């Protein structure tokens, strides 16, 4: 094809030994590649390890940028090295961005030291926000592919306020007991497909939050993890909106939940038009769960408002429950779940509990409410 223009971090003094701080080299390389015209590869050379503090790669850019993360990015473990304690690497406002790991690149958050200081893991500790390893924010026409993200400080990959996004052939991994290490976090993002990916992490494999519309999740493996979850929705008495989610082709193994919708008492808004189909459950706790009994304070009041859940289809779901209840519908009394469909569902090893749920059975369904 075209003759490629390449801006390499090598050209800006990045040593690539994993001990020298290469942050400023990345900053300057990003200035060069972002300001250039036309198609530009920003290259992180294969076989090297680049220690990075927090870094913000800000657009919009004159270039059509392909960031070739072929080597390894290694996070500082010093809390003072993070401008925003919630962010390690953040792409901000970059349109027509493609991030390609070439099946060799690794984004390593070095999260263990953050995890042991987490309050979920040491209750003599205060609960603190830890950095998201890789954030894409305010991007249109985004592509993320062929990349591995491991051991994030907290959230591994977050896609926030994005539009027209394709994530394909990524690997996200962290220990099963690592706290709050969401695999792929999707929030206020519309028209996104995540396909052909593998997530085994310490929290939600995929979490879909408010503002999300037209989300496609195809051919993913999840385990360890907390499953594929819409929510949390309506926390802090927020108005939530989620519409048009399809998970089609997934294998969940040993996860704390299978396919989950979770909303908070006091919330408002709606979560609608959701389809979970062609799902294999291998020893999964809470294979199917909608749970609206959540509150964000230590002493919950009687619920005045709830997120309304409507048009949820569970289709061609098969496998084995590790929970007493394979199917759990705990929905709001004042806003009951509506248009819940169970179509060719066969989960053995568990029973079904259904409260304030209008369910419809289509074909062979086991277990039944």
Swiss-Prot record:
Instruction: Name its cellular compartments.
Output: Secreted, Cell wall
Keywords noted in UniProt? Cell wall, Cell wall biogenesis/degradation, Glycosidase, Hydrolase, Repeat, Secreted, Signal
GO CC annotations on file? extracellular region
Found in which tissues?
Expressed in roots and in the abscission zone of the sepals, petals and stamens of flowers, at the base of cauline leaves and in the basal cell of trichomes from senescing leaves. Found at the site of lateral root emergence, in the dehiscence zone of anthers and maturing siliques. Also expressed early in anther development, at the time of microspore separation. Expressed in germinating seeds, at the point at which the radicle broke through the seed coat. Not expressed at the junction between the seed and the funiculus or in the dehiscence zone of anthers or pods.
Q: What is its EC number?
A: 3.2.1.15
Extract the PROSITE patterns matched here.
POLYGALACTURONASE
Which InterPro entries does the annotation name? Glyco_hydro_28, PbH1, Pectin_lyas_fold, Pectin_lyase_fold/virulence
* Primary location class: secreted
List the molecular function annotations (GO) for this entry.
polygalacturonase activity
Q: What PANTHER family does this protein map onto?
A: PTHR31375
Q: What is this protein called?
A: Polygalacturonase ADPG2
Which lineage do the record's taxonomy fields give for this organism?
A: Eukaryota, Viridiplantae, Streptophyta, Embryophyta, Tracheophyta
């Amino acid at each position: 094809l075209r003759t490629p223009t390449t801006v390499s971090v090598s050209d800006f003094g990045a040593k690539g030994d994993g001990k020298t701080d290469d942050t400023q080299a990345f900053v300057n390389a990003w200035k060069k590649a972002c300001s250039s015209n036309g198609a530009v590869n920003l290259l992180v050379p294969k076989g090297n390890t680049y220690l990075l503090k927090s870094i913000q790669l800000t657009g919009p850019c004159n270039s059509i940028l392909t960031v070739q993360i072929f080597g390894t990015l290694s996070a500082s473990q010093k809390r003072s090295d993070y401008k925003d304690i919630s962010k390690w690497i953040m792409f901000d406002g970059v349109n027509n961005l493609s991030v390609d790991g070439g099946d060799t690149g690794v984004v390593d958050g070095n999260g263990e030291t953050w995890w042991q200081n987490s309050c979920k893991r040491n209750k003599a500790k205060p609960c603190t926000k830890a950095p998201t390893a890789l954030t894409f924010y305010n991007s249109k026409s985004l592509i993320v592919k062929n990349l591995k993200v491991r051991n994030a400080q907290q959230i591994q990959i977050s896609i926030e306020k994005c539009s027209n996004v394709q994530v394909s052939n990524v690997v996200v991994t962290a220990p099963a007991d690592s706290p709050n290490t969401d695999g792929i976090h999707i929030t206020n993002t519309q028209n996104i497909r995540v396909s052909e990916s593998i997530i085994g992490t310490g929290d939600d494999c995929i979490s879909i939050e408010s503002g999300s519309q037209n989300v496609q999740i195809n051919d993913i493996t999840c385990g360890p993890g907390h499953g594929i979850s819409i929510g949390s929705l309506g926390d802090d008495n927020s108005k939530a909106f989620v519409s048009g989610v399809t998970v089609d082709g997934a294998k969940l193994s040993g996860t704390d939940n299978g396919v989950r919708i979770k909303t908070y008492q006091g919330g408002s808004g709606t979560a609608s038009n959701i389809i979970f189909q062609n799902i294999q459950m291998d020893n999964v706790k809470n294979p199917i769960i909608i749970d609206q009994d959540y509150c964000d304070k230590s002493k919950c009041t009687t619920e005045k408002s709830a997120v309304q859940v409507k048009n949820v289809v569970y289709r061609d779901i098969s496998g084995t429950s590790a929970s007493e209840n394979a199917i759990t519908f705990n929905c709001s009394k004042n806003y009951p779940c509506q248009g819940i469909v169970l179509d060719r569902v066969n989960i053995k090893g568990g029973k079904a509990t259904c409260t304030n749920a209008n369910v419809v059975d289509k074909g062979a369904v086991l277990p039944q409410c």
